[PDB]
Coordinates of C-alpha atoms in Angstrom, one line a residue:
Chain G
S8 CA 17.7 18.3 -18.6
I9 CA 20.6 20.3 -17.6
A10 CA 19.2 22.1 -14.6
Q11 CA 18.4 18.2 -13.3
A12 CA 21.3 17.7 -13.7
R13 CA 23.1 20.6 -12.3
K14 CA 21.2 20.3 -9.5
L15 CA 22.5 16.6 -9.2
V16 CA 25.7 17.9 -9.1
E17 CA 25.0 20.4 -6.4
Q18 CA 24.2 17.9 -4.3
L19 CA 26.5 15.7 -4.7
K20 CA 28.4 18.1 -3.0
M21 CA 26.8 18.7 -0.5
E22 CA 26.9 15.3 0.6
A23 CA 30.7 15.2 0.2
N24 CA 30.7 18.5 2.3
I25 CA 29.9 16.4 5.5
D26 CA 32.8 14.7 7.6
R27 CA 32.2 10.9 7.8
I28 CA 33.5 9.4 10.6
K29 CA 34.5 5.5 11.8
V30 CA 32.7 2.1 11.3
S31 CA 34.3 1.9 14.6
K32 CA 33.5 4.5 16.7
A33 CA 29.6 4.8 14.9
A34 CA 29.5 1.6 16.0
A35 CA 31.0 1.4 19.4
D36 CA 28.3 4.6 20.1
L37 CA 25.3 2.2 18.8
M38 CA 26.7 -0.7 21.2
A39 CA 27.2 1.4 24.3
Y40 CA 23.6 3.1 23.8
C41 CA 21.9 -0.7 23.3
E42 CA 24.3 -1.5 27.1
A43 CA 22.9 1.6 28.9
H44 CA 19.2 1.2 27.8
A45 CA 19.2 -2.5 28.0
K46 CA 17.0 -2.1 31.8
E47 CA 14.6 0.9 29.2
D48 CA 13.9 -2.6 27.0
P49 CA 11.1 -4.9 28.3
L50 CA 11.3 -6.9 25.1
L51 CA 14.6 -7.4 26.7
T52 CA 14.7 -8.5 29.4
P53 CA 10.8 -10.2 30.6
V54 CA 9.5 -7.6 33.0
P55 CA 7.3 -9.4 35.5
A56 CA 4.0 -9.9 35.0
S57 CA 2.9 -7.7 37.7
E58 CA 4.6 -5.4 36.1
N59 CA 4.0 -5.3 32.8
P60 CA 0.4 -4.0 31.3
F61 CA -0.7 -5.8 28.9
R62 CA -0.7 -9.4 30.9
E63 CA -3.0 -11.6 30.8
Chain W
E11 CA 27.0 18.8 -23.2
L12 CA 24.9 16.6 -20.6
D13 CA 27.4 13.6 -20.4
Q14 CA 29.7 16.7 -19.1
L15 CA 27.7 17.1 -15.9
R16 CA 27.1 12.9 -16.3
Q17 CA 30.8 12.3 -16.0
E18 CA 31.6 15.6 -13.4
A19 CA 28.5 13.7 -11.0
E20 CA 30.0 9.7 -11.7
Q21 CA 33.1 11.8 -10.3
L22 CA 31.5 13.3 -6.8
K23 CA 29.6 9.7 -6.8
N24 CA 33.3 8.0 -6.7
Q25 CA 34.2 10.7 -4.6
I26 CA 31.4 9.5 -2.5
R27 CA 31.9 5.8 -2.9
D28 CA 36.2 6.0 -1.5
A29 CA 34.9 8.2 1.1
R30 CA 32.7 6.0 3.4
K31 CA 35.1 2.8 1.7
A32 CA 38.2 4.3 3.2
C33 CA 35.8 5.2 6.7
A34 CA 34.9 1.3 6.9
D35 CA 37.9 0.9 8.5
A36 CA 35.3 -2.2 10.2
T37 CA 32.4 -3.7 10.5
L38 CA 29.8 -3.5 13.3
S39 CA 29.7 -8.0 12.9
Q40 CA 33.3 -7.5 14.4
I41 CA 33.0 -4.9 16.9
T42 CA 30.1 -7.0 18.6
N43 CA 30.9 -10.6 18.8
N44 CA 32.0 -10.8 23.1
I45 CA 28.5 -9.8 23.6
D46 CA 26.2 -12.4 24.2
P47 CA 23.5 -12.9 22.6
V48 CA 20.0 -12.0 23.1
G49 CA 19.1 -15.3 22.6
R50 CA 15.7 -17.0 22.6
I51 CA 13.4 -13.5 23.5
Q52 CA 9.9 -15.1 23.2
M53 CA 6.8 -13.5 22.4
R54 CA 3.5 -14.7 22.6
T55 CA -0.2 -12.5 21.9
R56 CA -1.7 -11.1 24.8
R57 CA -4.2 -8.8 23.1
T58 CA -5.7 -9.5 20.0
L59 CA -8.0 -6.4 18.4
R60 CA -10.7 -7.6 15.8
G61 CA -12.7 -5.2 14.5
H62 CA -11.9 -4.1 11.5
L63 CA -13.2 -5.8 8.2
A64 CA -10.6 -5.9 5.2
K65 CA -7.4 -5.6 5.1
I66 CA -4.8 -3.3 7.6
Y67 CA -2.6 -0.9 5.9
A68 CA -1.4 1.0 8.9
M69 CA -0.9 1.5 12.5
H70 CA 0.5 3.9 14.4
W71 CA 1.4 4.1 18.9
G72 CA 0.3 6.8 21.3
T73 CA 3.2 8.7 23.1
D74 CA 0.7 7.2 26.5
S75 CA 1.5 3.4 24.1
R76 CA -1.8 3.3 24.9
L77 CA -4.1 4.3 21.5
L78 CA -3.2 3.1 18.9
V79 CA -4.8 4.2 15.3
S80 CA -6.0 1.7 12.4
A81 CA -6.7 2.4 8.2
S82 CA -8.4 -0.2 7.2
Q83 CA -9.7 -0.6 3.6
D84 CA -13.1 -0.9 5.1
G85 CA -12.9 3.1 4.8
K86 CA -12.1 2.2 9.0
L87 CA -9.8 4.5 11.0
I88 CA -10.0 2.7 14.5
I89 CA -8.3 4.1 17.8
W90 CA -8.0 1.3 20.2
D91 CA -7.2 1.7 24.0
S92 CA -4.8 -1.3 23.9
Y93 CA -4.4 -1.8 27.9
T94 CA -8.4 -2.6 27.9
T95 CA -9.0 -3.9 24.4
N96 CA -11.7 -1.2 24.0
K97 CA -11.9 0.7 21.2
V98 CA -12.1 4.0 21.4
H99 CA -12.9 6.0 18.1
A100 CA -13.9 4.9 14.9
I101 CA -13.4 6.8 11.7
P102 CA -15.7 7.0 8.6
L103 CA -13.7 8.2 5.8
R104 CA -14.5 8.4 2.1
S105 CA -11.9 6.8 0.4
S106 CA -11.5 2.8 0.8
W107 CA -8.3 2.4 0.4
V108 CA -5.9 3.6 3.1
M109 CA -2.6 3.9 3.3
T110 CA -1.1 5.7 6.0
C111 CA -2.8 6.8 9.4
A112 CA -0.7 8.9 12.1
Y113 CA -1.2 8.9 15.6
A114 CA -0.1 13.2 16.4
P115 CA 2.2 13.3 20.1
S116 CA -0.1 15.1 21.3
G117 CA -2.5 13.0 21.7
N118 CA -5.4 15.7 19.9
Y119 CA -5.3 14.7 16.4
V120 CA -5.1 12.0 13.9
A121 CA -4.2 11.1 10.4
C122 CA -5.1 9.2 7.2
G123 CA -4.2 9.0 3.3
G124 CA -4.0 7.3 0.1
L125 CA -4.7 7.0 -3.4
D126 CA -7.3 9.4 -2.9
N127 CA -4.1 12.5 -2.9
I128 CA -5.2 13.4 0.4
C129 CA -4.1 13.9 3.4
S130 CA -7.0 14.4 6.1
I131 CA -6.3 15.3 9.7
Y132 CA -9.0 14.2 12.5
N133 CA -9.2 16.3 15.3
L134 CA -9.7 13.8 18.6
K135 CA -11.1 16.5 20.6
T136 CA -14.1 17.3 19.3
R137 CA -16.5 19.4 21.4
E138 CA -19.2 16.8 21.2
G139 CA -17.4 13.8 20.8
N140 CA -17.7 12.8 17.5
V141 CA -14.6 13.6 15.4
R142 CA -14.2 14.7 11.4
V143 CA -12.0 16.3 9.1
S144 CA -9.9 19.0 10.5
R145 CA -7.9 20.4 7.6
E146 CA -8.4 18.4 4.0
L147 CA -4.4 18.6 3.0
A148 CA -4.2 18.6 -1.2
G149 CA -1.6 19.4 -3.1
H150 CA 0.2 16.3 -4.1
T151 CA 0.4 14.8 -7.2
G152 CA 0.6 11.0 -6.0
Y153 CA -0.4 8.2 -3.5
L154 CA 0.0 9.8 -0.1
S155 CA 2.0 6.8 0.9
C156 CA 3.3 7.5 5.2
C157 CA 2.7 10.6 6.7
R158 CA 4.2 11.5 10.3
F159 CA 3.5 14.6 13.0
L160 CA 6.4 16.5 14.3
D161 CA 4.1 18.7 16.6
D162 CA 0.8 19.6 16.5
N163 CA 1.4 21.6 13.5
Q164 CA 3.6 20.3 11.7
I165 CA 3.3 16.7 9.4
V166 CA 5.6 15.3 7.1
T167 CA 4.0 13.4 4.1
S168 CA 5.9 11.0 2.2
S169 CA 3.7 10.3 -1.2
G170 CA 4.2 8.3 -4.6
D171 CA 4.6 11.4 -6.2
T172 CA 9.2 11.5 -5.8
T173 CA 8.8 13.8 -3.3
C174 CA 7.7 14.9 0.8
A175 CA 6.2 17.1 2.5
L176 CA 6.0 19.5 5.8
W177 CA 2.5 21.1 5.6
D178 CA 1.5 23.1 8.3
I179 CA -1.6 22.5 9.5
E180 CA -2.8 26.3 10.6
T181 CA -2.1 27.1 7.0
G182 CA -2.7 24.0 5.1
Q183 CA 0.2 25.1 2.8
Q184 CA 3.7 23.4 1.9
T185 CA 6.4 25.4 3.7
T186 CA 8.9 23.0 2.5
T187 CA 9.3 20.2 -0.5
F188 CA 11.4 17.9 -0.5
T189 CA 12.3 16.7 -4.0
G190 CA 15.1 14.9 -5.4
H191 CA 13.9 10.9 -5.1
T192 CA 13.1 9.0 -9.1
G193 CA 11.2 7.2 -7.2
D194 CA 7.2 6.2 -4.8
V195 CA 8.4 7.7 -1.4
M196 CA 6.9 4.9 0.0
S197 CA 8.0 5.0 3.9
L198 CA 9.3 7.7 6.0
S199 CA 10.5 8.5 9.9
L200 CA 11.0 11.2 11.8
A201 CA 14.3 11.3 14.4
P202 CA 13.3 11.8 18.1
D203 CA 14.2 15.3 18.1
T204 CA 12.1 15.9 15.4
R205 CA 15.0 18.3 13.5
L206 CA 16.1 15.1 11.0
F207 CA 13.6 12.5 8.8
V208 CA 14.8 9.8 6.7
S209 CA 13.2 8.4 3.3
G210 CA 12.9 5.4 1.4
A211 CA 11.9 4.9 -2.2
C212 CA 11.9 2.7 -5.3
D213 CA 15.3 4.4 -6.4
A214 CA 16.3 1.6 -3.7
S215 CA 17.5 4.8 -2.4
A216 CA 17.1 6.3 1.6
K217 CA 17.8 10.0 2.2
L218 CA 17.8 12.2 5.0
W219 CA 15.9 15.3 4.8
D220 CA 16.0 18.4 6.9
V221 CA 13.2 20.1 8.3
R222 CA 14.4 23.3 9.0
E223 CA 16.1 23.5 5.7
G224 CA 15.0 22.3 3.0
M225 CA 17.3 20.1 1.4
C226 CA 19.1 16.3 1.7
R227 CA 21.3 15.8 3.6
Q228 CA 22.7 12.3 2.7
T229 CA 21.8 9.2 0.7
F230 CA 21.6 5.9 2.1
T231 CA 21.5 4.3 -1.2
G232 CA 22.7 -0.1 -0.5
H233 CA 19.7 -1.6 -1.1
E234 CA 18.8 -4.1 -4.1
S235 CA 15.2 -3.6 -4.5
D236 CA 12.1 -1.1 -3.5
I237 CA 12.2 -0.2 -0.1
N238 CA 9.2 -0.8 1.6
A239 CA 9.9 0.5 5.8
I240 CA 12.1 2.1 7.5
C241 CA 12.2 3.4 10.9
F242 CA 14.7 5.3 13.3
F243 CA 18.0 3.8 15.9
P244 CA 16.5 5.7 19.4
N245 CA 19.9 7.4 19.7
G246 CA 18.9 8.6 16.4
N247 CA 22.2 7.5 14.6
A248 CA 20.9 5.0 12.2
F249 CA 18.5 4.0 11.0
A250 CA 17.2 0.5 10.0
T251 CA 15.7 0.0 6.5
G252 CA 13.4 -3.0 5.3
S253 CA 12.8 -3.5 1.9
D254 CA 11.0 -6.5 -1.3
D255 CA 15.2 -7.9 -1.7
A256 CA 13.8 -9.2 2.2
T257 CA 16.5 -7.9 3.2
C258 CA 17.3 -5.0 6.2
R259 CA 19.7 -3.1 6.0
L260 CA 21.3 -0.9 8.9
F261 CA 22.3 2.6 7.6
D262 CA 24.3 5.0 9.9
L263 CA 24.1 8.7 10.1
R264 CA 27.9 9.5 11.2
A265 CA 29.0 7.2 9.0
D266 CA 27.3 7.5 5.9
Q267 CA 27.1 3.7 5.2
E268 CA 25.3 0.2 6.0
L269 CA 26.4 -0.9 8.9
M270 CA 25.0 -5.0 8.8
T271 CA 22.5 -6.8 6.7
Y272 CA 19.7 -8.6 8.6
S273 CA 19.0 -11.3 6.2
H274 CA 19.0 -15.1 6.6
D275 CA 18.4 -17.0 3.7
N276 CA 15.3 -18.8 4.7
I277 CA 13.5 -16.1 4.8
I278 CA 12.7 -15.5 0.7
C279 CA 9.6 -12.7 0.8
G280 CA 10.2 -9.0 1.1
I281 CA 9.6 -6.5 4.3
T282 CA 6.5 -4.8 4.9
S283 CA 7.1 -2.9 8.7
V284 CA 10.5 -2.5 10.8
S285 CA 11.0 -0.6 14.4
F286 CA 13.2 -0.5 16.8
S287 CA 13.7 -2.1 20.5
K288 CA 13.3 1.4 23.6
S289 CA 16.9 -0.3 23.7
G290 CA 17.6 -0.6 19.8
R291 CA 19.1 -3.7 20.6
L292 CA 15.8 -5.6 18.7
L293 CA 14.7 -4.8 14.9
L294 CA 11.1 -5.5 14.9
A295 CA 10.8 -7.0 11.0
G296 CA 7.4 -7.7 9.5
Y297 CA 7.4 -10.2 6.2
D298 CA 5.4 -10.9 3.5
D299 CA 5.7 -14.3 5.6
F300 CA 3.0 -13.4 8.2
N301 CA 5.7 -13.5 10.4
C302 CA 7.7 -10.8 12.2
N303 CA 11.3 -12.1 12.8
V304 CA 12.9 -10.4 15.8
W305 CA 16.4 -10.2 15.1
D306 CA 19.0 -9.0 17.7
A307 CA 20.7 -5.2 15.7
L308 CA 24.2 -5.5 17.1
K309 CA 24.3 -9.2 16.1
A310 CA 22.0 -9.8 13.1
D311 CA 21.0 -12.7 14.4
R312 CA 17.5 -13.8 14.6
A313 CA 16.8 -13.3 17.6
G314 CA 12.5 -14.7 17.7
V315 CA 10.0 -15.3 15.8
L316 CA 6.6 -13.5 16.5
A317 CA 3.8 -15.8 14.3
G318 CA 0.2 -16.7 14.1
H319 CA -1.1 -14.4 11.9
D320 CA -3.4 -15.4 9.2
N321 CA -1.9 -13.0 6.5
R322 CA 0.8 -10.3 5.3
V323 CA 1.5 -8.5 8.0
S324 CA 1.1 -5.0 7.4
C325 CA 2.5 -2.9 10.0
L326 CA 4.3 -3.0 13.1
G327 CA 5.2 -0.5 16.1
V328 CA 7.0 -0.5 19.2
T329 CA 5.6 1.1 21.7
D330 CA 7.1 4.4 22.9
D331 CA 7.8 3.1 26.2
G332 CA 9.2 -0.3 24.6
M333 CA 6.3 -1.9 26.8
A334 CA 4.5 -4.2 23.9
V335 CA 4.8 -4.3 20.3
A336 CA 1.5 -4.3 17.6
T337 CA 1.3 -5.6 14.5
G338 CA -1.5 -5.0 12.2
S339 CA -2.4 -7.7 9.4
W340 CA -4.0 -8.7 6.3
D341 CA -6.4 -10.8 7.7
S342 CA -8.1 -7.5 9.0
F343 CA -6.3 -8.4 12.7
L344 CA -4.4 -6.0 14.7
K345 CA -2.1 -8.4 17.7
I346 CA -0.9 -6.8 20.8
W347 CA 2.6 -8.8 21.4
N348 CA 4.8 -8.8 24.4
Chain M
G2 CA -19.1 -4.9 36.0
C3 CA -17.1 -4.6 39.2
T4 CA -13.9 -3.6 41.3
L5 CA -16.0 0.0 41.0
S6 CA -14.4 1.4 37.8
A7 CA -16.7 4.6 37.0
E8 CA -15.0 5.8 34.1
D9 CA -13.9 2.1 32.8
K10 CA -18.1 1.1 32.3
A11 CA -18.5 4.4 30.1
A12 CA -15.7 4.0 28.0
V13 CA -17.2 0.0 27.7
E14 CA -21.1 1.8 26.9
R15 CA -19.0 3.5 24.4
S16 CA -17.2 0.3 23.0
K17 CA -20.6 -1.1 22.5
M18 CA -21.8 1.8 20.7
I19 CA -19.1 1.6 18.3
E20 CA -19.1 -2.5 17.7
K21 CA -22.5 -1.8 17.2
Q22 CA -22.2 0.4 14.7
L23 CA -19.5 -1.5 12.8
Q24 CA -20.9 -4.6 13.3
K25 CA -24.6 -2.3 11.6
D26 CA -21.4 -1.8 8.4
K27 CA -20.4 -5.6 8.5
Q28 CA -23.5 -6.5 7.0
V29 CA -23.4 -4.0 4.1
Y30 CA -19.9 -4.6 3.3
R31 CA -20.4 -8.3 3.6
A32 CA -23.0 -7.9 1.0
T33 CA -21.4 -5.4 -2.0
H34 CA -19.7 -6.8 -4.4
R35 CA -16.7 -5.5 -5.9
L36 CA -15.3 -5.3 -9.0
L37 CA -12.0 -4.4 -10.1
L38 CA -12.4 -1.6 -13.3
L39 CA -8.7 -2.4 -15.0
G40 CA -8.8 -0.9 -19.0
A41 CA -7.4 2.0 -21.0
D42 CA -8.1 5.6 -20.7
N43 CA -9.2 5.0 -24.5
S44 CA -11.9 2.8 -23.3
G45 CA -13.9 5.4 -22.3
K46 CA -14.8 3.1 -19.1
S47 CA -15.5 7.3 -18.1
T48 CA -18.3 6.9 -19.6
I49 CA -20.4 3.6 -18.3
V50 CA -18.7 5.5 -15.1
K51 CA -21.0 8.5 -15.1
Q52 CA -24.0 6.1 -16.7
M53 CA -23.3 4.2 -12.8
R54 CA -22.9 7.1 -11.1
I55 CA -27.1 7.5 -13.4
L56 CA -28.0 4.3 -13.0
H57 CA -27.9 2.4 -9.8
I69 CA -10.8 9.3 -6.2
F70 CA -12.0 6.6 -8.9
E71 CA -14.4 4.8 -6.7
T72 CA -18.4 3.7 -7.9
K73 CA -20.8 2.6 -5.7
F74 CA -24.0 2.0 -7.2
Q75 CA -26.9 -0.1 -6.1
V76 CA -28.3 -2.6 -8.4
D77 CA -31.8 -3.3 -6.5
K78 CA -31.2 -4.8 -3.4
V79 CA -26.9 -5.1 -4.1
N80 CA -24.6 -2.7 -3.6
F81 CA -21.3 -2.9 -6.3
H82 CA -18.3 -1.1 -5.3
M83 CA -15.7 -0.6 -8.1
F84 CA -12.2 0.2 -7.3
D85 CA -11.7 1.4 -11.1
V86 CA -7.4 1.8 -10.9
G87 CA -6.0 1.5 -14.4
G88 CA -4.2 -1.7 -14.2
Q89 CA -2.8 -0.7 -17.2
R90 CA 0.3 -0.6 -19.9
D91 CA 1.5 2.9 -18.6
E92 CA -0.5 3.6 -15.6
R93 CA 1.2 3.2 -12.1
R94 CA -1.7 1.9 -10.5
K95 CA 0.0 -0.9 -8.8
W96 CA -3.1 -2.3 -7.0
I97 CA -3.8 -5.3 -8.3
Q98 CA -2.0 -8.0 -5.0
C99 CA -4.0 -5.2 -2.4
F100 CA -7.7 -5.6 -3.3
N101 CA -7.5 -8.7 -5.2
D102 CA -10.3 -10.8 -3.6
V103 CA -13.1 -8.9 -5.6
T104 CA -16.7 -10.2 -7.4
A105 CA -15.5 -9.2 -11.0
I106 CA -13.5 -8.1 -13.0
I107 CA -14.3 -5.3 -15.2
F108 CA -12.1 -4.7 -18.4
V109 CA -13.2 -1.9 -20.9
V110 CA -12.4 -1.9 -24.6
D111 CA -12.9 0.5 -26.9
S112 CA -13.1 -1.8 -29.6
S113 CA -13.6 1.1 -32.3
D114 CA -10.1 2.0 -32.2
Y115 CA -7.9 -0.8 -34.3
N116 CA -4.0 0.1 -33.9
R117 CA -4.6 0.5 -29.9
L118 CA -7.0 -2.8 -30.4
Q119 CA -4.0 -5.4 -29.9
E120 CA -2.3 -3.6 -27.5
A121 CA -6.4 -4.2 -25.4
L122 CA -5.3 -7.9 -26.2
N123 CA -1.7 -7.3 -24.2
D124 CA -3.9 -5.9 -21.9
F125 CA -6.2 -8.3 -21.1
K126 CA -3.1 -11.3 -21.4
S127 CA -1.2 -10.1 -18.5
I128 CA -4.9 -9.4 -16.3
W129 CA -5.5 -13.3 -17.2
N130 CA -3.0 -14.6 -16.6
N131 CA -2.1 -12.8 -13.3
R132 CA -2.1 -15.7 -10.9
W133 CA -3.2 -13.1 -8.1
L134 CA -6.2 -12.2 -10.0
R135 CA -6.3 -16.4 -11.5
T136 CA -9.9 -16.8 -9.8
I137 CA -11.5 -13.7 -10.6
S138 CA -13.0 -13.5 -13.5
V139 CA -13.4 -10.7 -16.3
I140 CA -16.8 -8.3 -17.5
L141 CA -15.3 -7.9 -20.6
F142 CA -17.1 -4.9 -21.7
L143 CA -16.7 -3.9 -25.1
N144 CA -17.6 -0.6 -25.5
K145 CA -18.0 2.3 -27.9
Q146 CA -19.5 -0.5 -30.2
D147 CA -21.6 2.5 -32.6
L148 CA -18.0 3.9 -34.4
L149 CA -17.1 0.4 -34.7
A150 CA -19.9 0.0 -36.6
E151 CA -19.4 2.9 -38.0
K152 CA -15.7 1.9 -39.2
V153 CA -16.8 -1.7 -40.7
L154 CA -20.2 -0.2 -42.1
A155 CA -17.6 1.8 -44.3
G156 CA -14.4 1.1 -45.7
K157 CA -12.2 4.0 -44.4
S158 CA -10.2 0.7 -42.3
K159 CA -10.0 -2.6 -42.0
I160 CA -9.7 -5.1 -39.5
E161 CA -7.2 -6.8 -42.0
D162 CA -4.9 -3.7 -41.8
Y163 CA -3.5 -5.2 -37.9
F164 CA -5.7 -8.4 -37.2
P165 CA -3.7 -10.6 -40.2
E166 CA -6.3 -13.5 -39.2
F167 CA -9.7 -11.5 -40.0
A168 CA -10.3 -13.6 -44.0
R169 CA -11.3 -17.4 -42.9
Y170 CA -13.8 -16.0 -40.7
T171 CA -17.7 -16.2 -40.9
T172 CA -19.8 -15.3 -37.9
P173 CA -20.3 -18.3 -35.4
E174 CA -22.7 -20.3 -34.8
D175 CA -25.6 -18.5 -32.9
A176 CA -23.6 -15.0 -32.5
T177 CA -26.7 -13.4 -31.9
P178 CA -27.9 -11.3 -34.8
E179 CA -28.7 -8.0 -35.0
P180 CA -31.9 -6.8 -36.4
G181 CA -31.4 -4.9 -39.7
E182 CA -27.9 -4.9 -38.2
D183 CA -25.0 -4.9 -41.2
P184 CA -23.9 -8.2 -41.3
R185 CA -20.0 -7.6 -42.2
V186 CA -20.2 -5.6 -38.7
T187 CA -21.7 -8.1 -36.7
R188 CA -18.7 -10.7 -38.8
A189 CA -15.8 -7.6 -37.3
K190 CA -18.2 -7.7 -33.8
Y191 CA -17.9 -10.8 -33.1
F192 CA -14.4 -11.1 -34.2
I193 CA -13.4 -9.0 -31.8
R194 CA -15.3 -10.4 -28.9
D195 CA -13.3 -14.0 -30.0
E196 CA -10.5 -12.3 -30.2
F197 CA -10.2 -11.9 -26.7
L198 CA -11.9 -15.4 -26.1
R199 CA -9.4 -16.9 -27.2
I200 CA -6.6 -16.0 -24.7
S201 CA -9.7 -16.4 -21.6
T202 CA -9.6 -20.0 -23.0
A203 CA -5.6 -20.7 -22.6
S204 CA -4.2 -20.9 -19.1
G205 CA -7.4 -21.8 -17.2
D206 CA -8.6 -25.1 -15.0
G207 CA -12.3 -23.5 -16.4
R208 CA -12.1 -21.4 -12.6
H209 CA -12.8 -18.1 -14.3
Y210 CA -14.6 -17.4 -16.6
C211 CA -15.1 -14.0 -19.0
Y212 CA -18.3 -13.1 -19.6
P213 CA -18.4 -10.9 -23.0
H214 CA -20.8 -8.0 -23.5
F215 CA -21.4 -5.9 -26.3
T216 CA -21.5 -1.9 -25.3
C217 CA -21.5 1.3 -26.3
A218 CA -21.6 4.2 -24.0
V219 CA -25.0 5.4 -24.8
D220 CA -26.6 2.0 -22.8
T221 CA -27.9 2.5 -19.7
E222 CA -28.4 -2.0 -19.2
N223 CA -24.7 -2.2 -18.4
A224 CA -25.4 -2.0 -14.7
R225 CA -28.1 -5.6 -15.1
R226 CA -25.5 -6.9 -17.2
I227 CA -23.0 -6.6 -14.4
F228 CA -25.4 -7.8 -11.7
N229 CA -26.4 -10.9 -14.0
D230 CA -22.8 -11.7 -14.5
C231 CA -21.9 -11.0 -10.4
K232 CA -25.0 -13.2 -9.7
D233 CA -23.8 -16.4 -12.2
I234 CA -20.1 -15.6 -10.9
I235 CA -21.4 -16.8 -7.4
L236 CA -23.3 -18.9 -8.5
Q237 CA -20.0 -21.1 -10.0
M238 CA -17.8 -20.0 -7.5
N239 CA -20.5 -21.6 -4.2
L240 CA -21.5 -24.6 -7.2
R241 CA -17.5 -25.4 -7.7
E242 CA -17.4 -24.8 -4.2
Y243 CA -19.4 -27.6 -2.9
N244 CA -18.1 -29.6 -4.9
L245 CA -21.2 -29.4 -7.5
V246 CA -19.6 -28.3 -10.8

C-alpha cells in the first residue's frame, strides 16, 4: 500500500534521473551500425551456397 | 494520504512523458528514407528437424551456431545438430510442459522451465555422456517463462510471479531479485555485454533491468497488449518487442522511447517470437498466422515471409553469426531457414 | 558412409540410438489418452487425484489396464491464472469435478461449466462431468438444514426424470435433488452444440475407487464417437 506507492515514486525519480537524447542521434547510430555490419549479415546479402553451411 | 503519493507519482509520469516528447525531435522513418529498401529477401527451408511428438514451445541457438536446443510438450529437450540434421542429446523431463529453454554460451549447459516453478539446469558434459539435472533452481511462486545464461554460472529467469531473478548456479540462491512488474513476465533478453537485460510482462510494459545493481533503470511501456517476446538490437542500444496486439515496437535505450511500429493491416494475430539479424536491419518476427514476417527494421517494411509451418510459430532464433534462422512451431517441427 | 568421416559415423550412431528412444516413446505418447482436469478447489478434485494415485506439478499418470492417461490438471477456474487452455488443446476428454454439496458455489460451478462448454478452443472435446462430494449433498438434502430452493429457483415443478437410475434404499428426495443438479448441467451442455461433444455425467464421491474405470469407459466412448463421425457413420 503505502510502501508500494513510495517505492513506485522512488522508481519514477530514478527513471527521470537519466539523460535522454534526441531521436535523430539514436536513429543515426542505429543506421550507421546497420550499414557498417551489412556484410556481416548473410541473411541480407545472399552468400554463395558454397560458403553457406546449411546449403542443400 | 495514499492519493498524495499517487498524484506525486502521476506528476513524475507526466515529467517522463513530456521529457520524452521534448527529446522526440523526429521519427526513425524520417531519418531512414534515402536508404534503399532491403528488397524481396527470400528464404527457403534448408533443413527441417522432426523429432518431437507434441508442440514445440522454445528454442535457443548455440554460440557456435550449430547446436540448438528445443523443448516440447512430449517431455523432451532435444539438442539438434543443425549442420547435419542429426541429434546430439534428448533429455527426458519430469514436467510435460516446458515453456522455456536456454543454451549456455560455453555450450556446457542447457536449461528448461515451466509451470513446475523450477528452473532445471542440465550438464551436457558428463563423465558417462548421459545428461541429468545439475541444479534444480526453486524459489519462484509463478511459472517460469524465459531463462537465459549470462555465463556458465549466472542465469536470469523471468517468471509469471511478477519478478526476474539472477540465480547463481554454483550456489543455487537468488543473488538479486528484480521485482516491480505488475504482471506475468512473459519473456526477457540479455544484451550482448550481459550487463543489462530487458523484460516484458502482461502489464504491456518493457523494463530495462541491471544485473549489477538490481534496479529497474527504465520502463518502455508503449504496447497496447501483452508483450509476448523481446530481443536486443546487436549494438545493444535498442530492442524490439512483439505483443498480442499484432505489433512489434522498436524501443530505444539512450532515448527511452519507441522509434518505429512494425505493424501491417493484413496481419491481425499476435506475435510469439522476435529476433534480429547480425546487422540488425532485419527483424524476424513470428506470428500466429503460422508465418514469420521478416521486417526491415530501419524502414518498417515487410521484407519477406517464411511460410511453410503447419501451426503456430512458437519460437524463432537467429544464429550468433547470422548464418541461418530457425523457427520452431506447434506442428512439432523446427525449420532452419537461411 | 563416405569420404572417411570418422567422427560423423559415430554421431550418426548416436542419433540412431536417440531416434530409437524417441520412436519407442512415440508408442506410449500416441496410446496415452489426454485429460484436462478442470474445476474449483472446493470440488474435491484432490481426493479424486489421490484415488488415481492409489488405483492406476499437478500431473497425473495413471494406467487403467493397458491404456495410459495423462491429466494436465490445470485449474481452468474463475480465479486461477492457468490460461493454458489454448495450449494442451487436443485432448481426449475434460474432467469437470463439481462439489454438488455446496449450493452457494454451485452457481459459480454452472458459470465455469458454461465457460468451458462454450469456449471455442475446447468445442470438439467432450466433458467427463464428475459431480463429486455427493455423500455430503445426500446428508444435506436428508436434513432440512439447506434446500435447493434457496439458490436455484426452479427446484419446484421438478419430478425425478424417467429412468433416472434409482439406488436401492436411497432417499427419494435426495435422488430428486441429485438428478436436478445433474440435469442443470446437462441443460448448459445441450446448448451451443452440433452434437460434437457430449457431457458424460457421473455421480461420484471421495470414497469411490471406480472413477478410473468410469474415465476409461467415457474415453473409449469418446474415441468411438469421434472415429464414427470421422468416417461418416454417425
